[PDB]
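Deviations from the work plan: none for this task. Representative record:
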Amino acid sequence: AITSVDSYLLSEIKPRLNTVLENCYIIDEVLKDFDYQTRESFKEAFCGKNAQHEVTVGFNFPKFKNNYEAHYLIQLGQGQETKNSLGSIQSSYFEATGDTLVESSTAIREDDKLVFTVSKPIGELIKVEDIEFAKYDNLQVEGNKVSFKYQTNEDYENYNANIIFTEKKNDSKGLVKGFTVEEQVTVVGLSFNVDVARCLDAVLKMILISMRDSIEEQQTFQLQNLSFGDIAPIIEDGDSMIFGRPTIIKYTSSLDLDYTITQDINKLTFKERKD
Amino acid sequence: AIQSQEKGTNQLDIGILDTGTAIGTTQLEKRISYRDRFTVPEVLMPQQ
C-alpha cells in the first residue's frame, strides 16, 4: 500500500479545519494564551459560520494566483529508509484486505440471532464498541453481517452500536513485501499580517495534535514529530511583504506490496521404497 | 505623468505574483509621501 502523505494531510486538514473554525468556543480554547487584540481580530475575520473571510489550503507551485490573506501551503520534502525486515517481509495474509473502516450500525433482530449490517463485506472484525462476546454468544461473521445469540441478549434488540472492521477484497493469499520509510513534509502558513500567521500556526498545531487519534495515522503514519522554523519574509518584491513560519512534519510509514501465491496443497503421496 | 509601466510576473511555489516598476512625475508644489496611493479609473487591466 503506497502512501501519499500529502493527499492524506489535505483530506485530514480540510474538514477538520473547517469544523474547528466553525465554532468560537474551540477557537477561544486554542487562543487562550494570546492577547485580546489579535485573538479577537482573528475571530472576527475567520471564525464563525457566517465568516466573510475564509482560509484555503493547497499544494505548491499553483499556476493560478493564490490568496495570501491566510493560506496553508504544503510541499512534499525529503524521505529516507530507516528500517528493514528479513527478506523485506512485513506480514502474511490469507485473505486480501483493504482499508480499515469504522461504521455505525444499529442492532437488528433475526429469528435466531441479533445482527448488525454493514456497508461492505468483512475480512476481519477488530472491535465492537463496549462489547466482549463470550462463547455463549457465539460471535459469527457471515459476509456483510455479524451476529450473536438472540435469547440471552434480548434486552439489547436496538443497541445503537458502532463497528471497527476491515474490507474484504479477495479470497487469495500472499505475502507482504516492503520496508519502512521515514518521511519529512513541510507545511507553512502565509499571510501579509504576521499576527494572522501566528494564530494560523497555533491552529495548525492544534489540528496536528487532534489528528493523532485518527484511525489512518494510528495504523499507517505512526511516530509524528514536529519542527518549526523562524518567522521570515517570504517575499519582499511586492508592495508589502509575505510573512510565514514553515513547519516540518515527520512520519513513519510502511511502503509495501502484496505478492500473491498460487501454491495450495490438498493431497499427500506418502509411499515407501524398495531395493 | 507616468512612464515605464511594467507588469512584472514572478512564478513561485506560493503562486504567481504581479509586481513591477512604474515611474511618475508630478506637478509643482505637491509634496508626495512614502506609500501614498494612486488609482487611474481610465486604464483597465486584464486579469484571469
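Strands of chain B lie at 2-3, 9-12, 15-18, 23-24.
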